[PDB]
Amino acid sequence: ATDFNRGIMKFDGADSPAMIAISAVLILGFIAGLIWWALHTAY
Amino acid sequence: AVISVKPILLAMTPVFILLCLFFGTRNGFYDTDQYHGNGSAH
């Protein structure tokens, strides 16, 4: 992740492992929340 | 009333073929400086 914080507009500072899990549950929850939408909203 | 793709492809094939066999002969920089050398992404 040190090569992911390359010296351009990145390194927001939230590359901590406490943030990685709480960013995952919203992102992987939105795809799962959209798939479970689809089988009941489309037909 | 559609332009067919067969007369526009058969007339574009033998210009594409004769231009690669010419443009292969013309190149620069890939034989003189070329510090990549052998290993093509090292």
Partner: protein, 655 residues
């Protein structure tokens, strides 16, 4: 008529082919074509002047009484889903055909003077012809698909032209913002283009009004649901014409070349952002809640862009914030309904902004003589005052362009501008008295920009005293730097100004509106009185005329100060000096926010879904090093497992 009108698609494809060739001549033959700067400029200009020869006869044939002529060619077909792409020659379309090729031939006459010291002289005429062919297809367009093929093309030509120099870091970031901010409107246009093909079923403007009005009263569509459709189409022209949410790219579009600013305020802005809503009036007049949205976001921008033009030190950044407001002054004319007057203030805007922009470039190429190439703001180093005291013909023509935008007695605007002030005090006078207050403020910054830099003394002594350039000593002070290639275009762009000194007059306003009928023959107007028009026009030429007397007295005292305004209204002056504090809302929230959302989609990629794949390869390698310890030598232990499995399979298989 038949070789004039069946070959009418040649007006887009002629100046495209002038850039197709030099684009093929610069990418393959750049050793000769970079040297062939002078012939390839005249070669590219020849296909534009022939395209001027089509339109000047395609429009003059239209006002004699010829019918509109349509053509449609199938573009992408499927089962029961056709896309048609052709053209129309419409008196609205043929009027815009003249404007976008007259000012394009003009700016290519201009371009031989502002450069030919620049090595990018050959490429600049390749991009300038790439603008026009992308632009001349937008005006002849019959469909909502066909206006969208050339919507995102002219933003591509606007991206390439702002980043023309591309060695400035400032012109780098300016080019990208002009593509992204227009793409939000293109995100809006694409939603309504599919959204209106969903509801109506056909992509043409004429077939969209009759089909939308068929479902809104029958009961298939809702009055609230179909209102958000035509709002989304309108979100397109708020980007290109720089309305309220999307206007941040115009101070930075002045980081490009000065010829381009004349063309991106006469072709992509006053044309593109207004031609679409003028063509979509079959949809908008059946929706009352949409037209009140258009006029409110137009009238706010007439106020919003006007005050940032005040205390603006840069000349091109003051003209850029002018045409934010003047386009905003015009889109609300399409929003209150009175749109034929909104279309005849379009022609005098495009021919005078280019008069004001190319006139401003005569100042910058003059001021490069005494000052180095870094500052282009109001004058320091022999400060502001005098340029017309040197008596140039370049300086008297950006006054005449400045004069006919406020509402002065003897010139234009008295015929076209104040017509939508009387039609806007009919319905909602609360949100539309705001245009009257800034009507004296549009008169302010225009004449604030005139006699600050054209009346006084501006050649004597250096305050900063650092030019040190042979390219500045050869920049020809005493404004004759403006060569022979500004004597024609600064004059010949004023020869349509006396034509609209004759047309669009109180007898030819009636005859030109008679050309500009809407989608139907009916014309909706509240009331027009004989006596009441005289004071509504007579008190309104005052607020223009006495609006500059407070500017004739403010910026002719040397300091910008009547009493207690040197210590200014800093609640409000910090807004206009720091440019509305609107660039920083879009930057600290959207630019940082998408630099914060995107980063943690990358780290959930590299660590969660890459963590599972790198765990299947880890629990199989440590399974291998767990049964590698099953064998340990000691061959008697191997004889146990042979004997234990004999005991196992005879308890396994008897039940």
């Amino acid at each position: 008529m038949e070789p004039l009108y069946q070959y009418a698609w040649l007006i887009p494809v002629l100046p495209l082919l002038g850039a197709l060739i030099v684009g093929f001549g610069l990418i393959a033959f750049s050793e000769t074509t970079s040297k062939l700067r002078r012939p390839s400029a005249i070669f590219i200009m020849a296909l534009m002047a022939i395209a001027m020869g089509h339109s000047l006869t395609l429009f003059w044939s239209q006002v004699q009484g010829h019918l509109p002529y349509t053509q449609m060619i199938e573009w992408a077909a499927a089962g029961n889903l056709h896309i048609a792409m052709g053209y129309v020659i419409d008196p609205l379309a043929a009027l815009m055909l003249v404007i976008v090729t007259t000012v394009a031939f003009l700016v290519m006459l201009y371009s031989d003077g502002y450069m030919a010291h620049d090595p990018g002289y050959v490429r600049f005429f390749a991009y300038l012809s790439l603008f026009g062919s992308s632009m001349l297809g937008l005006v002849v367009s019959p469909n909502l698909v066909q206006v969208y093929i050339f919507w995102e093309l002219v933003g591509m030509c606007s991206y390439l032209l702002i980043g023309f120099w591309y060695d400035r870091k400032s012109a780098a970031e300016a080019a990208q913002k002009a593509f992204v901010t227009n793409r939000v409107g293109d995100f809006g246009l694409l939603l309504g283009m599919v959204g209106l093909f969903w509801a109506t079923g056909t992509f043409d403007f004429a077939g969209m009004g009759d089909r939308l009005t068929e479902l809104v009263n029958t009961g298939l569509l809702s009055p609230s649901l179909a209102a958000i459709l035509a709002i989304l189409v309108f979100l397109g022209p708020v980007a290109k014409s720089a309305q309220f949410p999307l206007h941040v790219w115009l101070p930075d579009a002045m980081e490009g070349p000065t010829p381009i600013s004349a063309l991106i305020h006469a072709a992509t802005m006053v044309a593109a952002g207004v031609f679409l809503i003028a063509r979509m009036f079959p949809v908008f007049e059946q929706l009352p809640q949409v037209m009140t949205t258009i006029a409110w976001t137009g009238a706010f921008t007439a106020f919003m862009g006007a005050t940032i033009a005040i205390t603006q030190n840069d000349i091109k950044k003051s003209l850029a914030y002018s045409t934010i407001s003047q386009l905003g002054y015009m889109v609300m004319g399409m929003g209150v309904g009175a749109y034929s007057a909104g279309l005849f203030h379009l022609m005098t805007h495009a021919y005078f902004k280019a008069m004001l922009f190319l006139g401003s470039g005569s100042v910058i190429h003059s001021m490069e003589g005494v000052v180095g190439h870094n500052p282009d703001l109001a004058q320091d180093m022999r400060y502001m005052g005098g340029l017309r005291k040197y008596m140039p013909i370049t300086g008297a023509t950006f006054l005449v362009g400045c004069l006919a935008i406020s509402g002065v007695p003897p010139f234009a605007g008295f015929w076209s501008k104040d017509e939508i002030l009387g039609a806007v005090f009919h319905a909602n006078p609360a949100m539309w008295l705001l245009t009257w207050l800034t009507a004296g403020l549009t008169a302010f910054y225009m004449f604030r920009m005139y006699f600050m830099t054209f009346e006084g003394k501006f050649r004597n002594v250096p305050p900063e005293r650092q030019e040190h350039h042979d390219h500045h000593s050869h920049h020809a002070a005493v404004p004759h730097e403006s060569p022979w290639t500004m004597t024609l275009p600064l004059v010949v762009l004023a020869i349509p100004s006396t034509l609209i000194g004759f047309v669009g007059t109180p007898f030819n306003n009636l005859f030109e509106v008679f050309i500009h009928a809407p989608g139907e023959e009916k014309v909706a107007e509240h009331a027009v009185d004989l006596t009441e028009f005289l004071i509504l026009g007579g008190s309104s030429v005052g607020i223009g005329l006495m609006g500059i007397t407070v500017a004739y007295l403010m910026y002719l005292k040397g300091t910008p100060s009547p009493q207690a305004i040197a210590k200014a209204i800093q609640p409000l002056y910090q807004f206009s000096l720091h440019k509305w504090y609107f660039d920083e809302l879009y930057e600290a929230v959207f630019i940082k926010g998408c630099r914060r959302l995107a980063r943690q989609v990358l780290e959930v990629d590299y660590n969660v879904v890459d963590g599972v794949v790198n765990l299947t390869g880890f629990v199989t390698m440590v399974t291998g090093e767990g049964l590698k310890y099953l064998q340990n030598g000691r061959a008697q232990f191997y004889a146990l497992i042979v004997l234990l499995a004999v005991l196992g399979f005879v308890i396994f298989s008897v039940q």
